[PDB]
Amino acid sequence: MLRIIDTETCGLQGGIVEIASVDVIDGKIVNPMSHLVRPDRPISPQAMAIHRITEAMVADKPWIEDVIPHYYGSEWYVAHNASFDRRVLPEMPGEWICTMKLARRLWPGIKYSNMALYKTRKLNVQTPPGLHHHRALYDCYITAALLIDIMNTSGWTAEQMADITG
Amino acid sequence: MLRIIDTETCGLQGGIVEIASVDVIDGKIVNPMSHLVRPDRPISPQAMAIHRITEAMVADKPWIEDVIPHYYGSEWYVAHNASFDRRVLPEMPGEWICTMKLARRLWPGIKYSNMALYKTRKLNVQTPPGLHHHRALYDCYITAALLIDIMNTSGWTAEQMADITGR
DNA sequence: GTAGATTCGAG
DNA sequence: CTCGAATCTACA
Ligand code: NA
Ligand code: NA
Ligand code: NA
Ligand code: NA
C-alpha cells in the first residue's frame, strides 16, 4: 500500500499551511485525507500567491505536531520532490519514494514538475470538488495518477521504487 | 599592468611543457615571453594531440622551477579559466583575473572557450610567427585581445575584474 | 533555502 | 579521457 503525501507551506524554508494524502492500492486511488494546519511562522506573500491559503484560514487549526499522526501507518510515503516534504514535515515513520526521480529514470530529457508530467503523460484523474491546483489534496491526486502511470510503465514495486529513491 | 598567463601541459592534472605571457598596458600588448619547459612527468597523448609538443621538443629544457622566476612580479595575472593555470603552475603572487568568468557575466548564453569567444566577439589579434592554437604564446595573444574587448565593452577596472573572478 | 544532477571549461 | 565551480531544477 502506497501513500501519496503532499504539503503546502509558508515558503521554501518550511512551515505547513496544509497537508493531504491519498492511498494507491491495486492501481486505484482511495482514502483521501486533508488538513489545514496552523503554521509555526507567518505565511510569506510569495507562497500565498501560490496556494492562496490565508492566515485567517489556518488560525483556528491544529499544529502540525497534532495533525501529522493522522498520516502514520503506511509503509511507503510518496511525494513529488519528496526531499522537500520530508524536510518541512516532522519525521515520518516509513520509507520515502520520489516520483520526480522515477519520472526522470523512465522519461529522460523532458520537464519534471508535478503538473508538466501530468500533461506530457496525458493523464486524467477525478480531482475533488472545491479544490484547485496547489492544494494539498488536489496535487495528491495528480501525484498519485503519476505514480500509477510509473508503476504501469515499469512494473516497479514499492521496495524497488524506494531503492531508486535512496 | 595586467599580465596574461598561459600554460601548455601533459594532461589535466599538470606537468608543464610550455609557458608564456604578454603584458597589457593601456589597451596595448607588450613584453611577450615564452619558454618550452621539461615536464615533471610524461606527456600524455591526449595533451599532445592538442598542443603538439613532443617529448624530444622539451627533453633538454629547464624545469618549471628554473623558469617561473621570469614570470613573477606582476600585480595582476590574467588567464582563461585561471583556476587551471593557477593549479598546475607554481604558486604565484599578485591578483588573479579569469576571462572565462568575465565573459560569462558580460555575455550570458554563449560558449566560453578561448576560441569560441574569439569567434563570437570577432576578435582581431596579431599572433606570433610559426605557432598555432594551443601554443601558450599564441593563446596569450588571443586571451589578451579578449581581455581588451572585455574591458572596452564593460569598462570594468582590474579591481572590479578581480572581484568578479572571486577574491 | 535544499540538495542532487548536469554542464563546461582547461591540456 | 579529470573534476571543480557554476548553473539548473524540483518543492511553497
Ligand atoms: Na508538494
Ligand atoms: Na502542492
Ligand atoms: Na590555458
Ligand atoms: Na593554451
Residue numbers in the entry:
A (entry chain B): 1 to 166
B (entry chain A): 1 to 167
Provide passages from the article that reported this PDB entry.
ExoX is one of several redundant exonucleases involved in the mismatch repair system, UV repair, homologous recombination and the stabilization of tandem repeats in E. coli. Like TREX1/2, ExoX contains only an exonuclease domain; however, it can act on both ssDNA and dsDNA in a distributive manner and digests only one or two nucleotides per reaction cycle. To elucidate the mechanism by which dsDNA is recognized and processed by single-domain DnaQ members, such as ExoX and TREX1/2, we determined the structures of ExoX in complex with three distinct dsDNA substrates: 3′ overhanging duplex DNA, a 12 bp blunt-ended dsDNA and 5′ overhanging partially mismatched duplex DNA, referred to here as complexes I, II and III, respectively. The crystal structures obtained revealed that ExoX interacts with dsDNA via two DNA-binding sites, one for the substrate strand and another for the complementary strand.
Our structure of the blunt-ended DNA complex is the first to show the specific interaction of a DnaQ member with a blunt-ended dsDNA. Similar to complex I, two ExoX monomers bind to the individual ends of one DNA molecule. First, in addition to the two residues that interacted with the complementary strand and were observed in the 3′ overhanging DNA complex (Lys101 and Arg104), an adjacent positively charged Arg87 residue was also involved in complementary strand binding via an interaction with the +2 and +3 nucleotides of the 5′ terminus. Second, the coordination of MeA in complexes I and II is different. Compared with the penta-coordination observed in complex I, MeA is tetra-coordinated in complex II, with one proposed water nucleophile missing, accompanied by a slight reorientation of the His134 side chain closer to the substrate phosphate. This difference may be attributed to the pH at which the crystals were grown (8.0 for complex I and 6.3 for complex II). Third, at both DNA ends (A and B) in complex II, a wedge composed of two key residues (Leu12 and Gln13) located in the loop between β1 and β2 (loop 1) was observed. Leu12 penetrates between the two terminal base pairs, while Gln13 is inserted halfway between the two terminal base pairs and forms an interaction with the second nucleotide of the 5′ terminus. The wedging of Leu12 and Gln13 results in a distortion of the first base pair and facilitates full insertion of the first substrate nucleotide into the active center. Therefore, the structure of complex II suggests that ExoX unwinds the first base pair of the blunt-ended dsDNA and feeds the 3′ end of the substrate strand into the active center.
